[model samples]
Target chain A: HHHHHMFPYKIVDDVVILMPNKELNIENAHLFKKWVFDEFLNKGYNKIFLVLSDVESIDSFSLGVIVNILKSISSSGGFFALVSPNEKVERVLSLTNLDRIVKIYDTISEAMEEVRR
Target chain B: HHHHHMFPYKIVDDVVILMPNKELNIENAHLFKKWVFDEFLNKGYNKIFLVLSDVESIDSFSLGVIVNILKSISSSGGFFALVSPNEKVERVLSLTNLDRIVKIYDTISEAMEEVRR
Candidate 1:
């Protein structure tokens, strides 16, 4: 379904929360980034908190997509963070040192706390 | 690293435990399968228990790999089960209905108790 491939998302307290409508793999990785940029980040919303709890597995493909989104948001004086990536996704961030760039939180509240700040 | 890309694994109490050396995505997914078939499953080992606790994410690619391995092992009168997929991975199994095809356990002992039976 290439109707601008999208997923579930929302805005909470000026922060946008994103979850993969499906696994954020090669097929829809770019769409994931597109939504973040076009729908939220480029629209003047700064703080973006992604929830990976719905995503099953994210490899380097999606990892780069995530990193790319983070960079774009950060360049605009906003921030991008993640909440609850489970174990495997967390391990992926660590292995690629992507965790150093994006902040990962165990709970949405934690992401909200910092991004809100 | 294309030198027969492999990861950490071991045989314990007539059971083979598999863990991804890195995130189980496209890059090493096929290699992961190769190791199982050539090293253990085809070598007369029947019970294979995978520890996904080390993997960060799994999408259709790695999930397919896991499912394929489970099929091959079970076809030969053996079994392949999973241990601790975290919440997200568990959801993937449910989303794809893959959980029904592969038995998932929470602990190594639990997997062993059943596979050894």
Candidate 2:
């Protein structure tokens, strides 16, 4: 099954908006990590925006990947943010305090505004 | 070798304070989960306070365990909190948004105050 297309993301200038097309969990965490590290971070773009509006659930492994990415970006003097997380995803982000470390906004426009600033 | 002693904990009234004596990662996450579920939760302690003053690191699996315990506690009308997490640990909890779901305090007294109330 060719599921690679499921991971749809778009880049606007320096910001990359990643829209994973499935639930975020341990099962596919490695894939996300690989994509973020190999395809995104290594490419030299620092501003990363994870669009979580479609993600229904997020587990620890996936969260870990995001954290790892955040660390990488921050260490490299870049910024990472999240956009449009659903209520459930928002709750998880809030629960873990991930929302504090990574700027989360209701829309991509808001996230872009902050990251660009 | 019996390393269980490394996990020191205490109880104050209705709350149980778990002081894990080492870093929290995938290697020891299961043990902590077991202790939390089998020993504490099953023992009828409604309020759980995890004292992380000594823990220098925490990984995804450990975070998952904490989140699971949070879910269990909340569903049962209980409370879970973390006390005295170091900067790194605090950053991880904040990055994952765990701090919001579970109240975090700088001291056991602070956590106890909230959990007791």
Candidate 3:
């Protein structure tokens, strides 16, 4: 069965913003990765912003998949960052200590500053 | 099965330091959460420093777990940060956009400063 959750991404300048339509979990992990590798990475866009304001929950598997994508982008000499994670999702990242390694922001404009920096 | 990996932590003043002994993934995500909530949060310590100098990889699930902890601390009016992630892990964090929400440092000393701030 196809899940309703979709990974909708938009490109602004050198940064690609990935907006997930629902909670991220093991169910849609592979699809998310495929989209990143095939759609973003394949097109040579490395700077990415994962906008998580709409996502309510994210499991461990989904977090792992995102990290793998990060590895892919970093190896290619690109930059990535996060924007506007909801309270629940922000808590998950903080507990896992992912917040320390990744930079999360309150707005796309703020995230764009980091990409430029 | 009990994993070989351990979450070795230290307490300094008001800051609690959590040092992971291996790669952070689904295997040990729960254990890590338990320690943070039961040990650190339960003990009335909210400001935390996660040291990941030895960890080489972190999956998306693990990232979500950490984010949860961040939310916990944040909601409790506390702070959490990261210390000394290697290049690979740093790259993962960058792509995930976690670097923006959570403060990362090059040394325990630097992270301590953020906690103090």
Candidate 4:
């Protein structure tokens, strides 16, 4: 057990808005999983939107986690989304065709509207 | 004038392989032109392909210069191309649809094949 800092997040209705504090690469993807997904999914909160406003880029593993989370929620009749990915991250999403499968919104409001559905 | 550093380049047959030594932003766009296009086009070489292996990104103005270079060469019945742009640069190129208008190749060999055409 290290000095684990709380990642910033909040709940609005059934949707959890989880924001990354830094780049989502191999270096920190595990910590990211623990702080956001592992906890929220356990807390019975599966309807979530991960905000990538601060994240500049992502690699395959983290993207896999994003997809896995999407799978975890959507398969359970819940929901998941991505919000505010920067240009590079957006480029990777498009390249991987994740943009097609996942619901990615430019803003939290856009995602919330869909989440409400 | 200041101690002007020579931007490395070479000529093979009628094709000039121009390489950027640093980021192509607003600060260095003028210098880039002075070192490459202004000098080379005046020296009577227009069939050129800029090597972007070292360049990571580009801005609108530098992209405009690239198009202008393309125009100048193609109008004169010569050739122009781009080669080995890094991921971010390639993203920008595709986003701006520059990839559609310009001949971009993964390697110098690929371009030389087309340049020979």
Which candidate number has the best lDDT?
A: 2
Q: Give the lDDT of residue B114 in candidate 4.
A: 96
Clashing pairs in 4: none
lDDT of 1 by residue, A15-117 (tens): 8787665688656766677777787777898788888888887754465567566657767878788888978777666644556657889998888788657
> Which 10-residue window in model 1 chain A sums to the lowest lDDT?
A1-10
Give the whole-model CA lDDT for all candidates, comma-separated.
0.73, 0.78, 0.76, 0.75
For model 4 the local lDDT of residue A17 reads 87
* Per-residue lDDT of candidate 3, residues B13-48 (tens digit): 878888888877866776787767877788788898
The CA-based lDDT of model 2 is what? 0.78
lDDT by residue for model 4 over B10-116, one digit each (tens)?
78987888877777754676578767666787678878889998876765446545755765776777788899999987876675456766889999999999988
Sort all candidates by lDDT, best to worst: 2, 3, 4, 1
RMSD of 3: 13.4
The TM-score measured for candidate 3 stands at 0.51
Model 4 chain B scores worst on lDDT over the 10 consecutive residues at B1-10
Residue-level lDDT tens digits of model 2 in B1-117: 244344787777878889877888756876778877877788778698888888887765578677668767987998888889999888777656566567889998887777657
Lowest-sum lDDT 10-residue window in model 4 chain A:
A1-10
User: Better model by DockQ, 3 or 4?
Assistant: 3
Q: Stretches of candidate 2 above 4 Å error?
A: A1-6, B1-117
Clashes of each: 5, 13, 37, 0
**Cα miss at B65, model 2 (Å)?**
11
lDDT (0-100) at residue B88 of candidate 2? 81
Best candidate according to TM-score: 2
What stretches of model 3 exceed 4 Å from their correct place?
Answer: A1-117, B1-6
Residue B5 of candidate 2: its Cα lDDT?
43
Deviating ranges (above 4 Å) for candidate 4: A1-5, B1-117
